[PDB]
Design a protein around this ligand. Structure first.
Ligand SMILES: [Zn+2]
Ligand SMILES: [Zn+2]
Ligand SMILES: [Zn+2]
Length: 347
């Protein structure tokens, strides 16, 4: 029970850290990352499971304290994507707060302002780092995981996109400034003769994107070309050892490389392809294979979509006179997590 926490602290005078501030249980597995308190094993596994999951509109999908996909109290600050529970607030803060909060116009989440006292709800100090320690420690197969970046420290993401110009997208998500001549994104198509100096020369990069061309046979160039090349230059673009900063990459196969090549591409990029489809009316409209080190990209995979189902989406995809414009809406959201590491401007 939740509502049983108040007494459990005001009365029994019991240390918060000994009770899962998430659900209420008293069998805490470890301590909550963002706020002072503990978290039962089961709630922890739910937390991990929703670590960088985002909603199309751009906000954090689940509740910042417990992970309740429903009761959502949004943060006023524009650089904040965090949301909170109705029950969470009232349970840990004070009864009747969620109403007060939902009542305001410009609210500022507890993780945004400094304050640490707010009823029983306290924001751990230097949490962005603690949240890393968490995932790193509690996950059962941790992956590359860069600590999150404070808002006043975030800087413009520098992009390098090969074969495809991810600019329109990145710009709409507010990752790329519009009224800017500098242009922190460099598109490049024929890298056939590019060299490490070239890349190093092209300014340093934060995110390296690549993608095989759709089914609109652009070049005689086999598909594997684009893979390998992306591979090659990816290395060139990598941060000079001793680099702390977050460096992300992501290569997209637009359903154009056969199994053989597909497997190779997975040995080189060193990960199995996270296939993300577009289902409309329970039917597979389009799909796209994807490799990346970006947070949560794997938790976007449809184990459901079979190979054969895909080999078929392809067969029918060639047999038609269509532009086959590249599948933007599919990947467009995989970048949302970066919002927590780089600077954002939609204003
Ligand atoms: Zn719990
Ligand atoms: Zn909650
Ligand atoms: Zn906030």
């Amino acid at each position: 029970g939740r509502d049983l926490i108040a007494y459990e602290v005001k009365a029994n005078q019991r240390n918060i850290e000994d009770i899962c501030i998430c659900c209420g249980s008293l069998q805490v597995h470890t301590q909550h990352p963002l706020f002072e308190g503990g978290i039962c094993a089961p709630c922890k596994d739910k937390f991990l499971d929703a670590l960088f999951l985002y909603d199309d509109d751009g906000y954090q999908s689940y509740c910042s304290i417990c992970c309740s996909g429903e009761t959502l109290l949004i943060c006023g600050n524009p650089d904040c994507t965090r949301c909170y529970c109705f029950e969470c607030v009232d349970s840990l803060v004070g009864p009747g707060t969620s109403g007060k909060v939902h009542a305001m116009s410009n609210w500022v989440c507890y993780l945004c302002l400094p304050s640490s006292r707010s009823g029983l709800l306290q924001r751990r100090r230097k949490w962005r780092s603690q949240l890393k320690a968490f995932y790193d420690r509690e996950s059962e197969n941790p992956l590359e995981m860069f600590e999150t970046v404070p808002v006043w420290r975030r800087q413009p993401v520098r992009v390098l996109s090969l074969f495809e110009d991810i600019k329109k997208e990145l710009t709409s998500l507010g990752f790329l400034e519009s009224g800017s001549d500098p242009g922190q994104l460099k598109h490049v198509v024929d890298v056939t003769d590019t060299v490490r100096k070239d890349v190093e020369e092209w300014g340093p990069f934060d995110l390296v994107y690549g993608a095989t061309p759709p089914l609109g046979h652009t070049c005689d160039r086999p598909p594997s070309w684009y893979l390998f090349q992306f591979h090659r230059l990816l290395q060139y673009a990598r941060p000079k050892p001793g680099s702390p900063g977050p460096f992300f990459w992501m290569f997209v196969d637009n359903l154009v490389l056969n199994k053989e090549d597909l497997d190779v591409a997975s040995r080189f990029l060193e990960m199995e392809p996270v296939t993300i489809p577009d289902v409309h009316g329970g039917s597979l409209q389009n799909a796209v294979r994807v490799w990346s080190n970006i947070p949560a990209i794997r938790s976007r995979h449809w184990a459901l979509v079979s190979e054969e189902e895909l080999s078929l989406l392809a067969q029918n995809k060639q047999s038609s006179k269509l532009a086959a414009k590249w599948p933007t809406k599919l990947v467009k959201n995989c970048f949302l997590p970066l919002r927590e590491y780089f600077k954002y401007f939609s204003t």
